[PDB]
Design an enzyme around this catalytic site. Structure first.
Site: not given
Ligand SMILES: [Cl-]
Ligand SMILES: Nc1nc2c(ncn2[C@@H]2O[C@H](COP(=O)(O)OP(=O)(O)NP(=O)(O)O)[C@@H](O)[C@H]2O)c(=O)[nH]1
Ligand SMILES: [Mg+2]
Lengths: 162, 168
Positions: A53, A58, A61, A100, A111, A120, A124
């Site tokens: 991903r 952004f 991942q 997660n 990521f 985040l 995370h």
């Molecule tokens: Cl998210």
């Protein structure tokens, strides 16, 4: 703080090396999981797995080496481990943090931020940052898309501890 | 001679939003779960003798990212509210999706259809009667579906189009 590297490949062709400082000083359990998954010393880990991903602007991942479809992964401690702390924050490009499925579900997926992702914070666990090769991470973005699907297969062809 | 509709599929994680959409669009099912970020599809159909383009937005089953999800609801003309018949929490979640659509669109009368998916499975936790009662309370249709067998798939999307055509 230990340093680990990923040798990234695009459809098997070497793209470049990314190295990471892991914040063992502040996040020891989470740092040790990523370090060990990177050397493969437990008999499983990141080598061969893909960045499934990649969403430009952004993050990148990866880390699913158990199901190879973006849903799996496992830690060196069990299928999942608790959120160790939220001391470190997602302050800008190059931050390395755990992916997660909600509180206390850390496995192997992670990521790399390509932006400041402050929303985040507290959800995370941040445990490292890119040391060398941020230009390789930026290059990985060309292969991503709005829904994160990649146009070529982006893999961790080799990885280990420096 | 044609019309076009913006349909949005919403509901909890893993209920079958994507599997329903892919069945409509591509006429197949796969067991593998690939969690959605966002996908958009477009297909020409004939419903009740009238040709239409369906523009379908398949949303992720998360309610974070309110700015983005609010925009999905402002742009969407009609909504499939999907739960899975073997996931009680997903059914209890339905009222929240409906409330969000009403609040964002500032309206008590938005086209919507309640969809109880995974009807092929032998692990039911939500009774059909409970779902029919909830849909009746909302004044909207209830459709039982299975993305795996294709039961009710066309019916769900077509009924939503009828709800839009009626609402207008
Ligand atoms: Cl998210
Ligand atoms: N037996 C059965 N399985 C189904 C049905 N619909 C979906 N599934 C399965 O349920 C899982 C999740 O389906 P999916 O369509 O990805 O769910 P989603 O609601 O789109 N999830 P998300 O919110 O993450 O995007 C998949 O393994 C899929 O095969 C159905 O009607 N019957
Ligand atoms: Mg989906």
């Amino acid at each position: 703080n230990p340093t680990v590297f990923f040798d990234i490949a695009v459809d098997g062709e070497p793209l470049g090396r990314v190295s990471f400082e892991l914040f063992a000083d502040k996040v020891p359990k989470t740092a040790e999981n990523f370090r060990a998954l990177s050397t493969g010393e437990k008999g499983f880990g990141y080598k061969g797995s893909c960045f499934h991903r990649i969403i430009p602007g952004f993050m990148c991942q990866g880390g699913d080496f158990t199901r190879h479809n973006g849903t799996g992964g496992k830690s060196i401690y069990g299928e999942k481990f608790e959120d160790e702390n939220f001391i470190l924050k997602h302050t800008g490009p190059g931050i390395l943090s755990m992916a997660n499925a909600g509180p206390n579900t850390n496995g192997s997926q992670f990521f790399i931020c390509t932006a400041k992702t402050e929303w985040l914070d507290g959800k995370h666990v941040v445990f490292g940052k890119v040391k060398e090769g941020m230009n390789i991470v930026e290059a990985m973005e060309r292969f991503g898309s709005r829904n994160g699907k990649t146009s070529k297969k982006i893999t961790i062809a080799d990885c280990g501890q420096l | 001679s044609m019309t076009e509709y913006k349909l949005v599929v919403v509901g909890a994680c893993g209920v079958g939003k994507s599997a329903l959409t892919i069945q409509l669009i591509q006429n197949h099912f796969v067991d593998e779960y690939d969690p959605t970020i966002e996908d958009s599809y477009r297909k020409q159909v004939v419903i009740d003798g009238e040709t239409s383009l369906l523009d379908i937005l398949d949303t992720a089953g998360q309610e974070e990212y309110s700015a983005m999800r609010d925009q999905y609801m402002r742009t969407g003309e009609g909504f499939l509210l999907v739960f899975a018949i073997n996931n009680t929490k997903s059914f209890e979640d339905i009222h929240h999706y409906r409330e969000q659509i009403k609040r964002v669109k500032d309206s008590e009368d938005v086209p919507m259809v309640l969809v109880g998916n995974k009807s092929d499975l032998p692990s039911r936790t939500v009774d059909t009667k409970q779902a029919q009662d909830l849909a009746r309370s909302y004044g909207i249709p209830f459709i039982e579906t299975s993305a795996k067998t294709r039961q009710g798939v066309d019916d769900a999307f077509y009924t939503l189009v009828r709800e839009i055509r009626k609402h207008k």
